[PDB]
């Protein structure tokens, strides 16, 4: 079969700019592609049908081009409707679709909010217990979660949770939390969470302590 | 041009699926039919498609050991039966309709698509979700939901009393087999006491309604 | 959408049945009855592309091909390759279609080699084969009554691709496998002298059913040595596997033809010498449509080419290709109508095998293997005037034998020489 | 400046001999040997890039790696190409390389084909090679009188690509072109009772000198069933060919080996049986830098590549890619050192060719071909205690046999038997 | 070997714009790049190595940047002495040249004035006749010269040669001859230049009679 | 550091061309040396190099076998010679180095460059130049210089009183084997009798004194 890639995988770009996406075959084909937006919870649209068409009811601020092994897609200005996720399929053959694109604004860096919540006494009678931090309105989305409890580092028994980035301020939510059995909940003592992220100059501890909690 | 879907039923796995898809407001035998499926963090993944006035059919590889597709002319339907299901059938399926069968374009863009179906492959019970709200010890106020079955989960909390600056995480599906969530939103601490606070959580599957204050 | 075909064919040299030069203007004819006919996918476009299959001294060779066919494929991306016509540049070619389930079409090619569909899968050859040949050898041994022994030789030249190597062992291993006789075969050097005073001793031990592949002046200056050494036509007969009809000028519609003459002096000991020989060459077809495509590829060529085309069987090679390419489409067209792409391969190989097509040279039947049936005349001379005829015509479709008007085989004595003589060998 | 290294190899299957795993370790120690070295290229650094030979399957395929081999060279357009191993994956690249003028280094692809140069141009082979072994046949053959006639043995499994094919390939051919005496062949099958039962009734007439390419558990059951057929060693030499030691270990410098036990309750007959059985494998390099070598290996490839290694005879082949390796960046010196530049392929590799080199496995001599000369050991049993040591060693380059500590080769009758009996077969 | 090749072929920019020259390779080499500047009449001189390192004496406005088969020079802040014949040399092995690459000033269109001289009468005695018509202050260079014979296309016996451009006005100056043996030159009467350029609104003829002269 | 060649000779087709470039203010043994070809109108042209302490040389394909290049280190001086002249070997000649060779840094560029040597292959003779004036039948007036062989010519107007408005096109090689030129001069039309002109032509080789009156 033939593999379709996409570049770049991510780009940050503001509105009225000028953007363009790559689109890789790993064999020759002649025109055959088509461009698909997606937003999510809802369906993908139609936006070119050949390497160079252009289907109808489509805004003419979009553009295709580009042969053989490498098409591009230019948008000449971006609108708050028109970041999406973009996929590139090929038609000749047994149809395969790329990895996506995603498609984000461009914002200035922000500092996170660290906050931490020591597990509560009704999972402690359910058997169970559960610890929670969590890091509010921070930017960009990458950073780093590291749990410490009386220096000592557990993997494998952690879940992480991020939501989407919002309209009106453009932040990200990112929780992390650790779930223990109710019997190695009073062989330890304090339960930190270290956090590193490119807006913080050093990375923050947030910690407590079972007995005073 | 209107194309119809219905379903989301859960069942163990080992059963079948079938799914109906509806073309009215144009001519069905005009134009090709594909089904596409899409996982729910992986991306979109060509399944199969069907011509329906000679009668042909095209599936993947990895696809036509265990799928059936069928369509009925006199009203317009297709149907899809997917068997041997495992954990790895959970995911949102989509009817398509594009390029005209009187010349063979089978090359162009599907144009009209459906609104799509979520089919979840898991063995086990539509049990109740359990709430835990979270007090501290500039402060973490709000409600988790752990150990329910199945998605999905209405609104966080005070029914919409609170909606401006809110957040809610996606569902993580664990390792036994159920879901768990939570949304915290912290207000100043000089209000703490002044407003009280409690996260109603409704479950549709098994009809479970919680009010657990905060 | 566009239908991309690529050719692999000498585009310099004009010395091949198989050349462009040759091949090109019934390309384009049958490009031009592809688009005039509404049948054959409608709305869509048929490309070419073309690459040389000859290094720098101009002849084919098995290096050049595999490079170019790699670079068309990775250039262009075909959905069909046509040619080589070499076999030691096709083979590789094949080979590497076959690894990337391409269907390849050709006309060329007819060593037994390519007869094994599991390793040259996806192989169409719509032009003559050497087993075909076979069959005709064993029907006429089923119709003359020979049971025994056989015997046969080929002559070695430098120069080509060992033209009768690849025709001998098809045809006597298909002898072998159909008719269970004792068979020979023995190699010879046509340019040495002492080599035929060997065949002319060894000869009357072995056999008295002779097959000669070599060159027409070999033949001649065989046939006169047997006749000066005392062999005769009552006990030994001699068949000449000339397919493309060079002893005999074109092989073309009926008209005098007297190969043994040639002005050295010594012609009336040659008509008397080939009394015991006889042809074996292609069946020319004889519709009208045949006539009229002769004509305008001959004037196409002429106009387009610069190249002057002559009267002979060796234009039934290019008019192959041509039906060939036209049987392609339809298989095409099938799977586009029943739910396919152009780019599965299997479905229209599998179409176009076991399928009965009309085209100019007439109707053609592929079978479960994919190898067009070939029809074979006989040549006999005329006792009246020495002059040879044609006799006898083989049907591969159906597996008969049909004279022509009335003919009658003559032979010296009366009937068909034994086998193996009462007193043996 | 930089000079780029192709490397395509199994990159994840760790079974064979020339895996990325086992030899990613010896080029690491190699460019570090490079880099504390004054007189090896000086002011210049050597990077490396990747790319696999193996398919989905984890196989070594006959296209992955022409097609890796076409990727890196459109994408980085290397200086040098090192690997492939396996013979069908490695032909294909040979003539790539040979069309592109690129130089080509192996210490796999030990087949017969690779010595036509005239094809296989800018090819070195640092590896052990199968000619060599025939070379050492006919040295034992002219030591002990054996001079008429001998029989050989290959079995097939359908799992591997043909083992035994080309290893009694290469020793038929160089021992004809040698001794000219006259040489059987046969091939069986692994499975059991049909083929061994019709082998020990063919056997005594075809020969009594016989040589046996299998499996040691074949070869086991062979002389086993050959015990109560009545062969024996007064008249019967059974040579069995495991080059890399597998019925024994062959790393282990000083074990006893006792290749027929296997805990069956048929120990007694084994040991009985094996009295006229013999075993030629690869020499075991003895110099303290390969323990040394072996050792640093060992370390980084369980460091890095997460992987254990063995002991056994099958370590040489990374001392090989390390040596060939050194060496190429030797003439790669010295030809920059006459003013030519790092893409004379002609003048780099006719360096190489024929010359002498220290290395860790020794003291190397590539021949005037292109081939490493390699060594070989032939084991023995101990008359009195039943393990199998050490008892002959040969030398490529001044093809002599060497006794090892005053041992003798064990005759059950004194001497050993004659080709031809008496009676005749 | 490897054949490198420039773009554009040809380019005019004002003082203080920015322009960018272009090679491309027709294999793959890493960083084996020079850069030379000529000017008319001397040797070249370097200006960049390894692709990107600038040699010690060269001013800092120029640089250079790529890797692989594309490779691209910039100069900022054009200079009058900043106007040569710049290549680009792969230095892999076997080092090629390119094909060059002009750079001049860009300036206002102008129209050239025609001049005619008719032959001298010595040079009829010798034997030979030869008419001169000569452009002047025109711009840009590409202009198209035709010699009329009493309304008749001559072709194959006309040479032409352009100066190089000036400073001042920076113009050109072009001059067409014709030459004829010296029966050829009676035999007809009317001798004709047609000038068709750019800045001319239409072609100019400018002709004699050769019974006038 | 300088480098200094010599030489503006003619030779007939199918002799030898001999080229020597002396070196100054550096050692001679510890750096490449390069020679490169320019045509008039092609473009630059690289044919070879030598490295003089290992005593090797580098030669192009299309070269190599008529070229030969020495070198002697007691007077720092390198030579080339070149056989089979042609008449595409009309070319100018310059020796350039770059790149250090103790640790083989041949892709280094080219800094230093010498003054060139311009080499003319074709069959002909020295030949005195013939000049024509050039006058109408704002006023043009000019000198037309032909049939002189072999270069250079140098024109000047009124002996150098009168520069401006002087334009001097480059000479064409004619099929003859010969070369022709001609100078002009702007005047305004109000001096056309006036002032008097005269232009002066000189070729050093034929050692031609010619003032023509217009």
Redesign the interface.
Known sequence: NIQMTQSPSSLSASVGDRVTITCRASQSIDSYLNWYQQKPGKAPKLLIYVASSLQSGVPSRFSGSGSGKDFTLTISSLQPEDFATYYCQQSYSIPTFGQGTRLEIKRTVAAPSVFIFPPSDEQLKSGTASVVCLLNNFYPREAKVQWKVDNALQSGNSQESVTEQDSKDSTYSLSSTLTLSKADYEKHKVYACEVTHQGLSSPVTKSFNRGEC | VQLVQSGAEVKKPGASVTVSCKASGYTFTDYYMHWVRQAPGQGLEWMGWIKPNSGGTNSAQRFQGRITMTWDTSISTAYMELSRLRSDDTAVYYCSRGGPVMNYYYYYGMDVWGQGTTVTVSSASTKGPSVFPLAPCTAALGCLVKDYFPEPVTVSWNSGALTSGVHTFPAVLQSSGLYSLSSVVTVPSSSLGTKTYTCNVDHKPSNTKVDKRV | ??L?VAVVLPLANTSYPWSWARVGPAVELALAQVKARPDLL???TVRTVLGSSENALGVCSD?AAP?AAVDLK????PAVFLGPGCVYAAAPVGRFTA?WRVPLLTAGAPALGFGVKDEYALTTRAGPSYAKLGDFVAALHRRLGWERQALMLYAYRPGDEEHCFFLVEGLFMRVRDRLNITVDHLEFAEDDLSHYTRLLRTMPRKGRVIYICSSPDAFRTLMLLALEAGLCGEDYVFFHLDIFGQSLQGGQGPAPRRPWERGDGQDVSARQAFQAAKIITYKDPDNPEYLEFLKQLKHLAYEQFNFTMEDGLVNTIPASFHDGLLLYIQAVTET??????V?DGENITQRMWNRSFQGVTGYLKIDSSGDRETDFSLWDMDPENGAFRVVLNYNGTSQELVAVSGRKLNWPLGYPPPDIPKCGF
Chains 1, 5 share one sequence.
């Open positions: 959408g566009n991309t409608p709305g869509w290096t490079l990775w250039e262009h991306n690894h586009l109508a029943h739910g396919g792409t780019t």
